[PDB]
Design an enzyme around this catalytic site. Structure first.
Site, PDB file in Angstrom:
ATOM      1  CB  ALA A 155      40.983 -40.100  13.340  1.00  0.00           C
ATOM      2  CD  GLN A 190      45.446 -35.199  15.941  1.00  0.00           C
ATOM      3  OE1 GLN A 190      46.231 -36.107  16.819  1.00  0.00           O
ATOM      4  NE2 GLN A 190      45.165 -35.948  14.365  1.00  0.00           N
ATOM      5  CB  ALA A 212      43.739 -51.295  19.483  1.00  0.00           C
ATOM      6  N   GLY A 249      43.244 -50.255  14.664  1.00  0.00           N
ATOM      7  CA  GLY A 249      42.406 -51.161  16.069  1.00  0.00           C
ATOM      8  C   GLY A 249      41.251 -50.520  16.245  1.00  0.00           C
ATOM      9  CB  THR A 250      41.392 -47.429  19.102  1.00  0.00           C
ATOM     10  OG1 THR A 250      42.722 -47.931  19.235  1.00  0.00           O
ATOM     11  CG2 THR A 250      40.592 -46.812  19.813  1.00  0.00           C
ATOM     12  N   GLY A 251      40.034 -47.663  16.580  1.00  0.00           N
ATOM     13  CA  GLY A 251      38.543 -47.045  15.418  1.00  0.00           C
ATOM     14  C   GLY A 251      37.815 -48.354  15.120  1.00  0.00           C
ATOM     15  CD  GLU A 302      45.846 -47.564   6.433  1.00  0.00           C
ATOM     16  OE1 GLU A 302      45.328 -47.656   5.305  1.00  0.00           O
ATOM     17  OE2 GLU A 302      45.922 -46.022   6.964  1.00  0.00           O
ATOM     18  CG  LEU A 343      19.959 -35.364  12.013  1.00  0.00           C
ATOM     19  CD1 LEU A 343      20.387 -35.504  13.677  1.00  0.00           C
ATOM     20  CD2 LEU A 343      21.435 -35.159  11.497  1.00  0.00           C
ATOM     21  CD  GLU A 385      12.774 -32.282   6.493  1.00  0.00           C
ATOM     22  OE1 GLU A 385      12.889 -32.010   4.944  1.00  0.00           O
ATOM     23  OE2 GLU A 385      12.189 -31.263   7.072  1.00  0.00           O
TER      24      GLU A 385
HETATM   25  N1  LIG Z   1      42.529 -37.002   8.666  1.00  0.00           N
HETATM   26  C1  LIG Z   1      42.970 -37.182   9.399  1.00  0.00           C
HETATM   27  N2  LIG Z   1      43.789 -38.803   9.381  1.00  0.00           N
HETATM   28  C2  LIG Z   1      44.696 -38.800  10.484  1.00  0.00           C
HETATM   29  C3  LIG Z   1      45.076 -38.436  11.850  1.00  0.00           C
HETATM   30  N3  LIG Z   1      46.039 -38.838  12.851  1.00  0.00           N
HETATM   31  C4  LIG Z   1      45.431 -40.157  11.375  1.00  0.00           C
HETATM   32  N4  LIG Z   1      44.773 -40.149  11.143  1.00  0.00           N
HETATM   33  C5  LIG Z   1      44.916 -41.322  10.279  1.00  0.00           C
HETATM   34  O1  LIG Z   1      44.402 -42.846  10.680  1.00  0.00           O
HETATM   35  C6  LIG Z   1      44.468 -43.723  10.578  1.00  0.00           C
HETATM   36  C7  LIG Z   1      45.364 -44.246  11.795  1.00  0.00           C
HETATM   37  O2  LIG Z   1      43.590 -45.085  12.081  1.00  0.00           O
HETATM   38  P1  LIG Z   1      43.654 -44.842  13.813  1.00  0.00           P
HETATM   39  O3  LIG Z   1      41.829 -45.556  14.055  1.00  0.00           O
HETATM   40  O4  LIG Z   1      43.051 -43.108  13.079  1.00  0.00           O
HETATM   41  O5  LIG Z   1      44.500 -45.147  14.946  1.00  0.00           O
HETATM   42  P2  LIG Z   1      44.104 -44.702  16.308  1.00  0.00           P
HETATM   43  O6  LIG Z   1      42.991 -43.577  16.437  1.00  0.00           O
HETATM   44  O7  LIG Z   1      45.247 -43.986  16.128  1.00  0.00           O
HETATM   45  O8  LIG Z   1      44.054 -45.906  16.972  1.00  0.00           O
HETATM   46  P3  LIG Z   1      44.758 -47.683  17.014  1.00  0.00           P
HETATM   47  O9  LIG Z   1      45.165 -47.327  15.522  1.00  0.00           O
HETATM   48  O10 LIG Z   1      44.266 -48.142  18.114  1.00  0.00           O
HETATM   49  O11 LIG Z   1      46.164 -46.279  17.939  1.00  0.00           O
HETATM   50  C8  LIG Z   1      46.328 -43.261   9.580  1.00  0.00           C
HETATM   51  O12 LIG Z   1      46.227 -44.149   8.429  1.00  0.00           O
HETATM   52  C9  LIG Z   1      46.417 -41.590   9.066  1.00  0.00           C
HETATM   53  O13 LIG Z   1      45.815 -41.264   7.771  1.00  0.00           O
HETATM   54  C10 LIG Z   1      44.568 -36.865  11.366  1.00  0.00           C
HETATM   55  O14 LIG Z   1      44.540 -36.069  12.387  1.00  0.00           O
HETATM   56  N5  LIG Z   1      43.362 -36.661  10.985  1.00  0.00           N
HETATM   57 MG   LIG Z   2      46.206 -44.740  18.908  1.00  0.00          MG
END
Ligand SMILES: Nc1nc2c(ncn2[C@@H]2O[C@H](COP(=O)(O)OP(=O)(O)OP(=O)(O)O)[C@@H](O)[C@H]2O)c(=O)[nH]1
Ligand SMILES: [Mg+2]
Ligand SMILES: CC(=O)O[C@H]1C(=O)[C@@]2(C)[C@H]([C@H](OC(=O)c3ccccc3)[C@]3(O)C[C@H](OC(=O)[C@H](O)[C@@H](NC(=O)c4ccccc4)c4ccccc4)C(C)=C1C3(C)C)[C@]1(OC(C)=O)CO[C@@H]1C[C@@H]2O
Ligand SMILES: Nc1nc2c(ncn2[C@@H]2O[C@H](COP(=O)(O)OP(=O)(O)O)[C@@H](O)[C@H]2O)c(=O)[nH]1
Lengths: 354, 440, 433
Positions: B12, B15, B99, B144-146, B183, B252, B254
């Site tokens: 996420a 992108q 993750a 998980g990664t996030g 989630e 920032l 501010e």
């Molecule tokens: N706005 C937006 N949300 C996204 C996008 N791609 C994924 N998501 C959201 O991200 C969520 C998953 O969490 P992420 O932390 O992005 O997952 P990840 O980046 O693939 O990391 P991993 O779980 O380890 O693979 C999903 O529920 C989606 O709704 C995107 O391109 N744009």
């Molecule tokens: Mg991923």
């Protein structure tokens, strides 16, 4: 199926008294509360348990949980249960240095001893006293270790292979080719325990050089034999009393080593979580029919999610009494370990405080 | 001078970073390869604004960012896509598994042995800098990664760069739409690190952006590209004050002084008013009053929550384009007389305003219309607790039976951390409730 | 680099694996000689997942073929893609199991297990970062059940942390070709539930019904069923080989579908399926794919979801499509059929979207369900087991190989326990007093 949870506080040790070591655990009747040392003034978090035991200071006449009092509270009643004919299980849990050996085994002077010496001595004394010409008692013992969901023998000096586990249709789960030696007095039990504790698997980590890496079980099997004169002895009732040594729950940050250490920690965590789940559902089940009465058919206990709860199927439920002891380290240095110990202790039907 | 480091973690964040860097390169005249014909044609100016790029001797422009991930599939798209020649090859990719939607795997079983490289690259980037102001970490809850790696990285950067601000932009789970079954666990585990270390964490929701796209932009089947472009526009509006000239600029520091009454309530919403298609760009005036009113409409919020179920405690309006302070003051005066928009009794000042002379830049092939004026509204308000509260309910229904916990405990975690996170979130919600109570 | 080792034991597993390699080579543009003649560079982006490079640019599948008889090996070698495999990995004996689990596991497989494990070790060492294993095997009773579970036990001992995958054909009541199916099924499922991490139930009756009703075929053969199973297998591992907006790695699925460790038996499905006669009348879109996905007739395990409730569901889409459409459709499936979904889980539909659809379809979808009904698949077998264990109908062949009677009782009890946990959560309520 009744579950009684106890938590105990130990005194300071030589290292803690040598350094500037405070007391952080407070207890009132049945409620235990901790207070953060490195961020005070927030809110001492409080939990409730079935028993809270203060052995910290000294024989302080006012509220000092002696070893004998804990024995009379738990071990004597559960030994009565064992003599009646039903099964019994005892758990010991806590981090290294928390003082669980101080409760289970205790001092060697036999003046302030542990649960195990008092239990064994009363067992042998009551066996001796009631041994008339007809009733015959038998006691046998065995020692196994659960390591990465594999059972290994501690008494037999062979190469440490993995024994097999089977399910007899009537006798339930059991272990194959498990060494089983007879005992007559506590001295033989002490020697067997010393040999087993010498034979167990341990490894050095970032917290202790001799930290436990596996769970352990000391099973004692007690057999009664009536001798009415007619044509039979009628084995009558076979009661098992089990002792379990539980390894401490682990976090990857504390044990940062890669390879075998991480796998061992993960397996220990999974086994402990499954054990807590089973005990919690067991306590709920015991409470319901006792007060509620809804035979609730039988719901379903996940008895097959791990090997530790699988082997002790006949002791952990059906008709039996379970108990656990959690030792607390009073020093501020071990605050996180103590908090994790209390968090695990919150299992088995958490109750309400304030 | 005025420099920010932009770290992107997970799919996420990566992108959204693609969209963000597309927009920045379009704004600044830098072609994808990283060259800039404007400087060589004119031989003057400072179009290589230091807020996002570093200039080498040959004339290339390297963006200030690191694109960390654990799956090669996402970063390899950038390393072989249009912008392959923009970035330094040090993309900081882990040649291992993902993750697996496991916070523990991101944090302290797979995240280790790669955090050192990420921190070393950030060290080099900051040593190249001379006036560093803050960080821009892009991630998303529910992964998980996030969650895990953002937590670990924020901890390390707070220990190492504690005096510097650290902004976060993240995607929160929607009330009903969800693309994973774990989630709530991930979001709750992310609570205990997003609150303590980040100085201002911004929130967006996918369902709200879908509703915005349907109602205003008239897109019946939107995808993630439009969401990423909207988030990029929000971040560009936030950061424009550091690059282009303006009548009333906002730094920032501010932002943090105005939007943060107390340390633990630094979680404001963000919105963009003139999100209108080209067909409906006509038939409308899009004046300052119109966009200011559209900012406070419940329909235009990017998190599924009701502003009318709370009280605003801080508002910051960043205007771009042909605006003057007279119209802004008139719009604020108009807003202050409306009964529905209720303000706390302890904030008589209410509104903060900034104005910039650079209009928005249209991405080619996008969906946003060209507009002479734009406004980004940041709002610290009490309604956001609702968006938290529902999530807790989900977690409760998943924790009464310990479902999926064994995957987490099998990677170096105890079941008590879940309770620690739950009590931390409850404390946050109670503080938010406490702030809004009227004084006596 | 996430790379997987493939194994195939027994006749049915070998046939399904051969068709699977046909489909995969078609997807990645590999000729039968082992060379590339495909179209897009993306085929080489992640070719190492299933294949290994060879000096003359060629590509060898990372497959290990196992069988106690030589007939299936000769049939596969004397076939379309027979020459693609490595000859040194053709490990087999010269004495069949005779539909005997004990013969496959204890006596004849014990001699070959060293060779197959040596080849597996050689293949596994070369990998840069192993992810998991695959194993295709039927529960009929021959080489498949016995030596497959032996292989799973050995590999799980050797590689405790890598994800294990199996694809299995369960016995059926109406379609049966051997007399001792329940014994082998129970004995094999004991080791499967003990050791594996994901098992995808397949039923011949459901595949035949899909062929006759949805595909409107006249005289279906085993090739069509292998084709469907191959489509499912390719769909499962799509996100390791191609990019997409939302990735669904095997471990992501392992976390998502499995609430408790033992309930890892899944119901597979594929869409679209049109019968070559109604192709022009159908509108291929995400709502229509979702309609066909959650239909009882389109599932391959011969179970009725309306006779249970779903624990988890995963829909791996492939193609270009909007994420709002997918999310709204999954939410609609949740709300409209709320009675058939578990309440404790707030959301139980995992979603995955890939960018590269199949070769001749604008878009496609793979379905991976996990529901309670599956009890009905196991339950019937247990009944048959009792019907032949009440009298010891054919045990004297198994006891000849050195199998005690009690093992049958242990496996039966494990069957009953696994059935009990799927019902535990399947009445829809749980409250009152
Ligand atoms: N706005 C937006 N949300 C996204 C996008 N791609 C994924 N998501 C959201 O991200 C969520 C998953 O969490 P992420 O932390 O992005 O997952 P990840 O980046 O693939 O990391 P991993 O779980 O380890 O693979 C999903 O529920 C989606 O709704 C995107 O391109 N744009
Ligand atoms: Mg991923
Ligand atoms: C009109 C048109 O485009 O032709 C189609 C076709 O008519 C239909 C009916 C095809 C056709 O499939 C069948 O008739 C069939 C029969 C029994 C068992 C399986 C398939 C097709 O044969 C199948 C074939 O599908 C593929 O090529 C996919 O890639 C598929 N199979 C193979 O690639 C393949 C490779 C080597 C050898 C054989 C098949 C696939 C699906 C998922 C994952 C990987 C691959 C296609 C284009 C068609 C025909 C040829 C008629 C269908 O294909 C699938 C399985 O997706 C069956 O229903 C779909 C919908 C299609 O419209
Ligand atoms: N799908 C499919 N199933 C098969 C095929 N051949 C046999 N079977 C099934 O497998 C069962 C027999 O198992 P089998 O594979 O012969 O055992 P083996 O001796 O180990 O190979 C039968 O009940 C059939 O239903 C095939 O070509 N395709």
């Amino acid at each position: 199926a009744s579950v009684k949870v106890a938590v105990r506080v130990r005194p300071f040790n030589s290292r803690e008294m040598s350094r500037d070591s405070k007391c952080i655990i407070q207890m009132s009747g049945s409620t235990t509360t901790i207070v953060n040392p490195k961020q005070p003034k927030e809110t001492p978090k409080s939990f409730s348990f079935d028993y809270s035991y203060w052995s910290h200071t000294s024989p302080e006449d006012i509220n000092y949980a002696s070893q004998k009092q804990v024995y009379r509270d738990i071990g004597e009643e559960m030994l009565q249960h064992a003599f009646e004919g039903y099964n019994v299980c005892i758990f010991a849990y806590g981090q290294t240095g928390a003082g669980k050996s101080y409760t289970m085994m205790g001092k060697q002077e036999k003046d302030q001893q542990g649960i195990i010496p008092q239990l064994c001595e009363d067992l042998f004394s009551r066996i001796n006293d009631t041994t008339n010409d007809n009733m015959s008692y038998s006691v046998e013992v065995s020692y196994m270790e659960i390591y990465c969901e594999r059972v290994r023998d501690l008494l037999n000096p062979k190469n440490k292979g993995n024994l097999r586990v089977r399910e007899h249709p009537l006798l339930g789960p059991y272990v194959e080719d498990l060494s089983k030696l007879a005992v007559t007095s506590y001295n033989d039990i002490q020697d067997l325990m010393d040999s087993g504790n010498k034979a167990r698997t341990v490894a050095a980590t970032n917290m202790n050089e001799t930290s436990s890496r596996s769970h352990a079980v000391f099973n004692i099997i007690f057999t009664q034999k009536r001798h009415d004169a007619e044509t039979n002895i009628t084995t009558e009732k076979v009661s098992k009393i089990s002792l379990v040594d539980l390894a401490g729950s682990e976090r990857a940050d504390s044990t940062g080593a890669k390879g075998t250490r991480l796998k061992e920690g993960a397996n220990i965590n999974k086994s402990l979580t499954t054990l807590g789940k089973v005990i919690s559902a067991l306590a709920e089940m015991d409470s319901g029919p006792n007060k509620n009465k809804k035979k609730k058919k039988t719901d379903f206990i996940p008895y097959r999610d791990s090997v530790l709860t699988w082997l002790l199927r006949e002791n952990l439920g059906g008709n039996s009494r379970t108990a656990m002891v959690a030792a607390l380290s009073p020093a501020d240095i071990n605050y996180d370990e103590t908090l994790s110990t209390l968090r695990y202790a919150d299992r088995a039907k958490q109750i309400r405080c304030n | 001078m005025r420099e920010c480091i932009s770290i992107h973690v997970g799919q996420a964040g990566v992108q959204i970073g693609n969209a963000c860097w597309e927009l920045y390169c379009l704004e600044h005249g830098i072609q994808p390869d990283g060259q800039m014909p404007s400087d060589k044609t004119i031989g003057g100016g400072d179009d290589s604004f230091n807020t996002f790029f570093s200039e080498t001797g040959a004339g290339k422009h390297v963006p200030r960012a690191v694109f960390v991930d654990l799956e090669p599939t996402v970063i390899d798209e950038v390393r072989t896509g249009t912008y392959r020649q923009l970035f330094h090859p040090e993309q900081l990719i882990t040649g291992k598994e993902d993750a697996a939607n496991n916070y523990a795997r991101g944090h302290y079983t797979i995240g280790k042995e790669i955090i050192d490289l990420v921190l070393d690259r950030i060290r080099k980037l900051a040593d190249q800098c001379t006036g560093l102001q803050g960080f821009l970490v892009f991630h998303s809850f529910g992964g998980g990664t996030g969650s895990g790696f953002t937590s670990l990285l924020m901890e390390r950067l707070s220990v190492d760069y504690g005096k510097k601000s650290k902004l976060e932009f993240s995607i929160y789970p929607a009330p009903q739409v969800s693309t994973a079954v774990v989630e709530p666990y991930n979001s709750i585990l992310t609570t205990h690190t997003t609150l303590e270390h980040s100085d201002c964490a911004f929130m967006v929701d996918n369902e709200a952006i879908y509703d915005i796209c349907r109602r205003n932009l008239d897109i019946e089947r939107p995808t993630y590209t439009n969401l990423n472009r909207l988030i990029s526009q929000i971040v560009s509006s936030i950061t424009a004050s550091l690059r282009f000239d303006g009548a009333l600029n906002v730094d920032l520091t501010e932002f943090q002084t105005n939007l943060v009454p107390y340390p633990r309530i630094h979680f404001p919403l963000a919105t963009y008013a003139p999100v209108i298609s080209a067909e409906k760009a006509y038939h409308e005036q899009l004046s300052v009053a119109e966009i200011t009113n559209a900012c406070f409409e419940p329909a235009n919020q990017m998190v599924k929550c009701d502003p009318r179920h709370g009280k605003y405690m801080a508002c910051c309006l960043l205007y771009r384009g042909d605006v003057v302070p007279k119209d802004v003051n008139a719009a604020i005066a108009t807003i202050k007389t409306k009964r529905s928009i209720q303000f706390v009794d302890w904030c008589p000042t209410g509104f903060k305003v900034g104005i910039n002379y650079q209009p928005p830049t249209v991405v080619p092939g996008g969906d946003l219309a060209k507009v002479q004026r734009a406004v980004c509204m940041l709002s610290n308000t009490t309604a956001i607790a609702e968006a938290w509260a529902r999530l807790d309910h989900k977690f409760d229904l998943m924790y009464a039976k310990r479902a999926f916990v064994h995957w987490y405990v099998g990677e170096g975690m105890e079941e008590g951390e879940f309770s620690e996170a739950r009590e931390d979130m409850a404390a946050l919600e109670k503080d938010y409730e406490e702030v809004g109570v009227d004084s006596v | 680099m996430r790379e997987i080792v493939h194994i195939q034991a027994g006749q049915c597993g070998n046939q399904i694996g051969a068709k699977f390699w046909e489909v995969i080579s078609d997807e990645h543009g590999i000729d039968p000689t082992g060379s590339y003649h495909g179209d897009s560079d993306l085929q080489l982006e992640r070719i190492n997942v299933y294949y290994n490079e060879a000096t003359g640019n060629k590509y060898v599948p990372r497959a290990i073929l196992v069988d106690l008889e030589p007939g299936t090996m000769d049939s596969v070698r004397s076939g379309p893609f027979g020459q693609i495999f490595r000859p040194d990995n053709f490990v087999f004996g010269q004495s069949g199991a005779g539909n005997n689990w004990a013969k496959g596991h204890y006596t004849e497989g014990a001699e070959l297990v060293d060779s197959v494990l040596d080849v597996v070790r050689k293949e596994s060492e070369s990998c840069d970062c192993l992810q998991g294993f695959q194993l295709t095997h039927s529960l009929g009773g021959g080489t498949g059940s016995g030596m497959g579970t032996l292989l799973i036990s050995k590999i799980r001992e050797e590689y405790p942390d890598r994800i294990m995958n199996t694809f299995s054909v369960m016995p059926s009541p109406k379609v049966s070709d051997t007399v001792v199916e329940p014994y082998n099924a129970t004995l094999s499922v004991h080791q499967l539930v003990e050791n594996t991490d994901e098992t995808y139930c397949i039923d011949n009756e459901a595949l035949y019904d899909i062929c006759f009703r949805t595909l409107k075929l006249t005289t279906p053969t085993y090739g069509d069923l292998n084709h469907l199973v191959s489509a499912t297998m390719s769909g499962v591992t799509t996100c390791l080989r191609f990019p997409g907006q939302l990735n669904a790695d095997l471990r992501k699925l392992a976390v998502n579908m499995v609430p408790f460790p033992r309930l890892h038996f899944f119901m597979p499905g594929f869409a679209p399926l049109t019968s070559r006669g109604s192709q022009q009348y159908r509108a291929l879109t995400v709502p229509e794919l979702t309609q066909q996905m959650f239909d009882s007739k389109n599932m391959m395990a011969a179970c009725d979801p309306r006779h249970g409730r779903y624990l988890t569901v995963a829909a791996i889409f492939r193609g270009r499509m909007s994420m709002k459409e997918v999310d709204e459709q999954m939410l609609n499936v949740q709300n409209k059929n709320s009675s058939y979904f578990v309440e404790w889980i707030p959301n139980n539909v995992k979603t995955a979207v890939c960018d590269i659809p199949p070769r001749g379809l604008k878009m496609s979808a793979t379905f991976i369900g996990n529901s309670t009904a599956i009890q009905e698949l196991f339950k019937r077998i247990s009944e048959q087991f009792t019907a032949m264990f009440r009298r010891k109908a054919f045990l004297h062949w198994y006891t000849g190989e050195g199998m005690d009677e009690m093992e049958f009782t242990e496996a039966e009890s494990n069957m009953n326990d696994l059935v009990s946990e799927y019902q535990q959560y399947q009445d829809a309520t749980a409250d009152e007093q």
